[PDB]
Structure 1
């Protein structure tokens, strides 16, 4: 769920998930996908695409087990869907962190997501 996702992003990036990625670019946070504005945004793009593919569980609300072991998100062996969900979340948290170097505050508070160029299909 967003609980785990939020925590992962926090654990990885060291950033407040909602603050730094709640309305970032065309893909981070709620809204759907749009043309990624940068690497950070594409993390979220990929992440949402990851969600799209998920069947059998709710990415937003379904809880799952993961742990923070040796500063690594380790998804619990939940079930197939929740594991994928966890891995989606882990991936984006890692991705967001990996792309903190190009994280652009200019993209941080995007009130204009619907005006993002349409996203390619996932």
Structure 2
């Protein structure tokens, strides 16, 4: 759930998930259409696709446990859903960090009509 994902985001980026990654570009937020606008937006797109591979799970509400070992995020053994969701979240938070150099405020509060089209995954 956002509790765990958000914690990862803050730990990796020094930004609060809401609002730094909740209205950015076409994919960092909710709703899902258009061409990702930059590297950070691509992280989000990949994150959605990652969740998309888990139709029997519910990442909005599925809580899971993760810990830090040797400085790195470790998705603790749980259910298949918990582990897979955790790995999705971990990959995205690290992707956000790796791309902080191009994080652009111009993409925050990004309008709907600038994001058209369906990009299947």
Shift of 1:68: 2.5
Q: Partners in 1 of 2:43 and 2:83 — Cα distance? A: 18
Match in the other structure for 1:120: 119
TM-score (norm 1): 0.91
Which deviations, in whole Å up to 9, do the C-alpha atoms of 1:35-80 show, x marking residues without a partner? 1000000000000011111133211111001112333211111111
TM-score (norm 2): 0.92
Q: Partners in 2 of 1:49 and 1:21 — Cα distance? A: 16
Q: Which ranges of structure 1 fall in alignment gaps of 5 or more residues?
A: none
What root-mean-square deviation, in Å, do the aligned CA atoms of Structure 1 and Structure 2 show?
A: 1.4
Tell me if the contact between 2:28 and 2:41 (Cα under 8 Å) persists in the aligned partners: yes
Which deviations, in whole Å up to 9, do the C-alpha atoms of 1:14-50 show, x marking residues without a partner? 1111121110000001222431000000000000011
Tell me if the contact between 1:47 and 1:88 (Cα under 8 Å) persists in the aligned partners: yes
Alignment of 1:55 with 2:55, yes or no, is yes
Tell me if the contact between 1:31 and 1:113 (Cα under 8 Å) persists in the aligned partners: no
Match in the other structure for 2:107: 107
Shift of 1:81: 1.7
Aligned pairs, how many? 121
Q: Partners in 2 of 1:52 and 1:59 — Cα distance? A: 10
Query: Which aligned pairs between 1:76-115 and structure 2 lie closer than 5 A?
Result: 76-110=76-110, 112-113=111-112, 115=114
Match in the other structure for 2:18: 18
Query: Which aligned pairs between 1:23-62 and structure 2 lie closer than 5 A?
Result: 23-62=23-62
